Symmetry: C2
Subunit: 729 residues, 2 copies
Amino acid sequence: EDNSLSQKKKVTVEDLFSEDFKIHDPEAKWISDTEFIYREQKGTVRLWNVETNTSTVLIEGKKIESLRAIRYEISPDREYALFSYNVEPIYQHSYTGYYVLSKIPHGDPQSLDPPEVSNAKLQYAGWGPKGQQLIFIFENNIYYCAHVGKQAIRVVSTGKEGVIYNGLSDWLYEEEILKTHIAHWWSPDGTRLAYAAINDSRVPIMELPTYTGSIYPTVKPYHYPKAGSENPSISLHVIGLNGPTHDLEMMPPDDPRMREYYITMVKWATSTKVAVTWLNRAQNVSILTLCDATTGVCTKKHEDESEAWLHRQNEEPVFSKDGRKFFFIRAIPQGGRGKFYHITVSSSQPNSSNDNIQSITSGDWDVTKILAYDEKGNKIYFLSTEDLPRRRQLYSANTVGNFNRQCLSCDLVENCTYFSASFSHSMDFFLLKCEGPGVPMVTVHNTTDKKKMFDLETNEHVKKAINDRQMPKVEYRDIEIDDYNLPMQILKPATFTDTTHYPLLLVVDGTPGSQSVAEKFEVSWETVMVSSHGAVVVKCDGRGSGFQGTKLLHEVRRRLGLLEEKDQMEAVRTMLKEQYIDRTRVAVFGKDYGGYLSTYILPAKGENQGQTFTCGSALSPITDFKLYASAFSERYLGLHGLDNRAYEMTKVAHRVSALEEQQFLIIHPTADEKIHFQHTAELITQLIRGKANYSLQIYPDESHYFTSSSLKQHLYRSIINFFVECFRI
Amino acid sequence: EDNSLSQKKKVTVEDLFSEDFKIHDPEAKWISDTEFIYREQKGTVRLWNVETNTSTVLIEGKKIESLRAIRYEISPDREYALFSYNVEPIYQHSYTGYYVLSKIPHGDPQSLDPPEVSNAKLQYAGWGPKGQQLIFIFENNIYYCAHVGKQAIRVVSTGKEGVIYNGLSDWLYEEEILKTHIAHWWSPDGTRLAYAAINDSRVPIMELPTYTGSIYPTVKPYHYPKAGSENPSISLHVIGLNGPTHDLEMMPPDDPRMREYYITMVKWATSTKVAVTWLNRAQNVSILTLCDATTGVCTKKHEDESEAWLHRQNEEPVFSKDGRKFFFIRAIPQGGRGKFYHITVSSSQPNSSNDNIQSITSGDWDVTKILAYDEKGNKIYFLSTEDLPRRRQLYSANTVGNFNRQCLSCDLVENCTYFSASFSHSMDFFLLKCEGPGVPMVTVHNTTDKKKMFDLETNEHVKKAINDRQMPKVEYRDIEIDDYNLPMQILKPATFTDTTHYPLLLVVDGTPGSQSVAEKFEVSWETVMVSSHGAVVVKCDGRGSGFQGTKLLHEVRRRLGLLEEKDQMEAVRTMLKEQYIDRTRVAVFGKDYGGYLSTYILPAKGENQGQTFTCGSALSPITDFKLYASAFSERYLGLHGLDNRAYEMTKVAHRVSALEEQQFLIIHPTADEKIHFQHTAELITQLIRGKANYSLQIYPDESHYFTSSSLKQHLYRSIINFFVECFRI
């Protein structure tokens, strides 16, 4: 009879870039145990107080006059504010630029400048743990200022442009392991500072072509350690923020099998003790070591090793205020189905006779992160995939022997299943965020009542926006292969009819250590053509996906580009039995490492039921892992330079021979740093040798991570225009 | 009978590259009036004599033994033979490789090496006019040997790699102005050598990217002087071949408007007096000067100046045995219809007040090049377009005041309109080649009887191949605009009908000073899709084409891409009025500058009758001539660096902003030294800002001219694969 449906307008790419979808996430942070910063919601910066419904005003709409200051931060004494403004990052997030100081009420902007230098570009200044003391880095040089008027102190200047780094990560550390642009850590007392010195003099330097600069454009050189080369030298140093500012280097472990080392984690156990994680070049040996800032004597506190490699080396254990027993996380055997990542409690100074290992929890799941620990009793707060590997939920257990796990969220709000939290100083309250599968939900809760006092932010404009069009139907049809349950999702355009036929799209990431099937709210081109152009998209997480077992992670080890390839063909076959899906119009997309996988998924199924994919695409693919970063190829296939016998067959060229009639497209910016253009050039040479058919598209002189909104709209429009052409018939 | 025969074979991509379609050329060259070299036809080389059928066996099937030397020459005494094996082309024509000397009959090889040097590549050797004297250039250094057994002498070694060239042209001279790699001329007595020293010390440098060299490829630098930049500085030198062999240089003219000059043409007038043509950087002031070889003193002879530029400065003069009055080609006003090229007699020593100018040929036509002149009477032979601008005919005039121009070729063979005649020393016998409009043949004739004693070659393989395949039907439909006639050639697959519709495809090159519509025989992609799929190809010589009036040549002065495009849409409208050509299928094509012209034929013709074209493409086009060499940009637009305002209006970007639905593609190799990939990259950047659909392909690390046949056939296959998809409906 009357079949009720949406019966209204659909979702186009244009509205994706509208401010209506834009999330005004305040991302507040607890300044004290009673209140947080309460960052910008729709402009000016207020300061909410959780105790009694107090929302004080700290910064006004004067940030507009500060040359549109992108970033701002408040000093711990909430009397001075730093405003940093620039034009664009460099690698992934190079938040350099001009740093200006302003008073707490308003006014008086002064550009922070290095001594004897006018207003000049500045990489990072930041704030100390206490007072108005701060540092700043210029030209890989760390200077300290005890006060606002204090003259810059030449604390260290041994760093050089692209050769010696201190306090900041190079390309490798910022893009492979440390993942952070800032690489220095303040002592709890605001008196000592730990900084990493990276020597890149030995690293080979590659130059990126330029085609937009001038009539005679010049290449841009930076050091990029390829697979089989030597890795950049690393050292750790400790300096004082007052008095002599004495520099103390930290002695690394000297195991016979651990000649070359990387620092994957440092944390201030106290104002003089630092916990450092050192990983061998083979990445199969990790050591947690306690070092003395004032002495430099490093005492090993823990050691682990694995056959393939060590995963998740960036974690920070929860150290008590007094330096007592801490809460690490590591891979415990967890019975069968491989070893799982669980929380462990280790004494303050474990004896060499034995370790104090004790799993706080247990189960076929993992802890993504450990939030914090309450010294006032038995409370350990963490985020885990206990309910499902595809969901992140906040859990709390007891440090005492009971180890009883207490829920905090477990569907606190039915709309949202993903979760993250940030507790106050005294663990009294905590900010909580949903960000999936509903609209991102920012709220304040308390550990005792577990009740929402009020709504910090909900973005009801996003609510009416998603309720204003044909929101695509989200569902899961998980598959099962070997002794593993492989997750996946499939989308419907909310006008789905089982009788009618819909073309299929596959999207692959497959990054070893990542997950593409998660219950986090996200909107992308996928929704753009699902809602408008009527497609069904497949996200699959084959073997090698993280958070589902170390055995699953290491299945693909020394078999890159082989097993997950079977995983996605199996997923395609399983969904191909559907009567509502089209077999002739099947497409595949990928990007980054998955882009390589996207190139490797152009088969001829058997010989009679061939022509699996109609149109294919890939963005910044990797063709030879030798031509990529060493810390990745060595990690997942073993160290190169000794004829590893693993990078030959993994080259996609040997598989791209056939390419009968598949419409194949490549998107690649010219100036990519993460995944050099040489991969695309080699693939093009192979295509030419193979008489293949393709259509290349290029972005001249653009960074890899591609952080321009209008350019992103152009890219997604090009993608959908390509894909609509092959689905149309 | 129960049997029948269907249609015969058509032409495909493989057919173009099939062995049967290969053209056989003997390229015989006179040694005297009686015998010529009679170079390779199908293997062995004879020494044919015109007088009585005497073909002396000189070269046999031993050329294969020396590692298949691509090029080879014979010493002027016919006693030594030089092979050039392992030769690879760097530029359009750079015969760098290994030279080996051998005895005339067969056997006894001898590597040609400079002293104290092992087996090394040599860029060029050449031969002297007499005996066994020869030279060779190594590291841009000229070493001369009076004898084969003579030790190599450091005759001149000041040359530097890519900075100082002696005896060889740079990029600019080999490509744009001199149009030949060789830059040394032997004296008629073979006693002194005239070579041009090109200095690149003050020339800007550009680095071509490399994406395949190694795991760590690096750019290759070469000096490419852009528009308005500092051009390479040319000096001229003469080195004796006996005694001290002291070098002498000839001072150029010192005209105030001619501060920067180039040596466009040089030829030994006598064994001691040499004629040199010096042209200003503005390329609008040329001076022909006769200079003493053993002294270097230069005496100015002739001058030519035009408001736009000068054309065909490469024309080689015709001198006498005694160095008397010589023959020149000048654009004399010729009354109406603009100035025209005609032969002029200049006395041996014209007076300083006035010269002895006297035109020989007259009419609304031009002499392409003067073949030769006979002192024993009055016989000057040349080729001219007197019959038609798309035909070349041999004409012989008389130096006596009568000036009787006799056509000798005219209609010697019915299937021969284009002609190429090469006369002997005594001019009694010459060699004639057809090169169209059918299969080419080479024949021996005598200027007296015009009698074919015998045929040198007929290209029987080509005749049988064209008989076995659908030869396209050649027809002409010329157009008229203003005071200029623009010939055009539309092609048919020899099976034209009216019931079917034939898709239209325009091909444009339109290089100023060149001819694109002519009766030459050629096989290319046009032949393919006319034969394979019947896409009618339209080629027209709009404004800017040469050999049809220096007024037409100079019409597009500083007005590039503005009048030719008008003429092209005029031709398109004239042709499209025929019903058998449809509206939906309209395509454009081009290469190099024509590719840019191809990019300029995608407007929106009004708004009601939009969609002017369907699929368009280009091969390494140019969008802004500032990114081009000075010798090409300044000639037509003037010197840059002072905001010439005739460069920035030529950009196609504003004209391709709309690009609503027309498909657009680019073919461009990575290392294109002719038109840099920077042009295409900037075009793509504007298109991204223009937000229009496009495509692109890359040939990584190859030159512009596609010296390997495999790359050429891949290009042709790619072109046809693109053009088939944009028409079928």
